């Protein structure tokens, strides 16, 4: 799977909000382009003169994420974050020249991402009360990953002593994205656990935080809530469900070739962090079938 790389695998089955610190700093921002940020401005102008209803929005930038020594007390993860924008994304990661920017960042800064917007995404492995994960089909008419399978998520817009408010907005945003797109009541959702961070090598290495969320409704009830919104209540064109039993071998199925990179990251991290039992009971052959 060359289109997805794991940047972080969380310990202990995944991390709750109270165990994560963020450092939001202009030291974590994109570096100005070698020939100047006028190249980004020019791409944006061209785009607005064809689609004048488009708007810019601020986004979080991932610089890096450092895990504490395993088994330790106190905060377990430090997220180093900057600020970027949808406009900066369109002029860097989305650019035809994105590979040239990665090579220049290696040369100039010893950092393939130094000249990339790298907006932070969020995604969920969302499990039902009857033990299915939730999948969504993308429109065949959108610019990114048309017609592919996705999981719930999005790219949060901003608004440890401003750090804890930033971690809160990240955890809040994955629940909000489930309520907005799947049309589930907020009171049917667990507090999220962070599973890890995955990079999309098809979009020049931009990263998504991947979470586990449990719903108290069954697959049939989740379907009813999604469909009862009508075609205008969701950006996706369909919902479907796979038994957690069968997620284990998804990379061996014909579905795998249809998953967008950030959804592949969510399923790999679900399989490594929530699946793959460590103890004698769940690791017994009748409960963990060989092969
Ligand atoms: C229309 N696309 C988006 O809203 C989007 C925004 C960002 Cl920041 C990254 C990828 N896609």
Swiss-Prot record:
It catalyses: UDP-sugar + H2O = UMP + alpha-D-aldose 1-phosphate. It comes from the Eukaryota. Changing residue 155 to A: Abolishes enzyme activity with UDP-galactose. Residues 117-273 form the Nudix hydrolase domain. Transmembrane segments: none annotated. GO terms for molecular function: GDP-mannose hydrolase activity; metal ion binding; UDP-sugar diphosphatase activity. Its EC number is 3.6.1.45. A motif (Nudix box) lies at residues 163-184. Its cofactor is Mg(2+). Keywords: Hydrolase, Magnesium, Metal-binding. The keyword NADP does not apply. It is an enzyme of class 3 (hydrolase). InterPro entries: NUDIX_hydrolase_dom (IPR000086), NUDT22/NUDT9-like (IPR055295). PANTHER family: URIDINE DIPHOSPHATE GLUCOSE PYROPHOSPHATASE, URIDINE DIPHOSPHATE GLUCOSE PYROPHOSPHATASE NUDT22. Hydrolyzes UDP-glucose to glucose 1-phosphate and UMP and UDP-galactose to galactose 1-phosphate and UMP. Preferred substrate is UDP-glucose. Belongs to the Nudix hydrolase family. This is Uridine diphosphate glucose pyrophosphatase NUDT22. It comes from Homo sapiens. The gene is NUDT22.
């Amino acid at each position: 799977d060359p289109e997805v790389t794991l940047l972080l695998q969380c310990p202990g089955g995944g991390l709750p909000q109270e165990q994560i610190q963020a450092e939001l700093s202009p030291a974590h921002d994109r570096r100005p382009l070698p020939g100047g940020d006028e190249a980004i401005t020019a791409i944006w102008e061209t785009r607005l003169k064809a689609q004048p209803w488009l708007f810019d929005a601020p986004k979080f930038r991932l610089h890096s994420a450092t895990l504490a020594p395993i088994g330790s007390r106190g905060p377990q993860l430090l997220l180093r974050l900057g600020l970027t924008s949808y406009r900066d994304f369109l002029g860097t990661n989305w650019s035809s020249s994105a590979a040239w920017l990665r090579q220049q960042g290696a040369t100039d800064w010893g950092d393939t991402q130094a000249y990339l917007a790298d907006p932070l995404g969020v995604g969920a492995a969302l499990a039902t009360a009857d033990d299915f994960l939730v999948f969504l089909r993308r429109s065949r008419q959108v610019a990114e990953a048309p017609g592919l399978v996705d999981v719930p998520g999005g790219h949060p817009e901003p608004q440890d002593l401003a750090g804890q408010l930033v971690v809160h907005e990240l955890f809040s945003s994955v629940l909000q994205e489930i309520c907005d797109e799947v049309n589930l009541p907020l009171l049917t959702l667990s507090q999220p656990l962070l599973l890890g961070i995955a990079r999309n090598e098809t979009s020049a290495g931009r990263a998504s935080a991947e979470f586990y969320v449990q719903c108290s409704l069954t697959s049939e009830q989740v379907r009813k809530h999604y469909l009862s919104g009508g075609p205008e209540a969701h950006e996706s064109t369909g919902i479907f469900f796979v038994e957690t039993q069968n997620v284990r071998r998804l990379p061996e199925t014909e579905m795998w070739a249809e998953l967008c990179p950030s959804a592949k990251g969510a399923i790999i991290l679900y399989n490594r962090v929530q699946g793959s039992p460590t103890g004698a009971a769940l690791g017994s052959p009748a409960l963990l079938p060989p092969l």
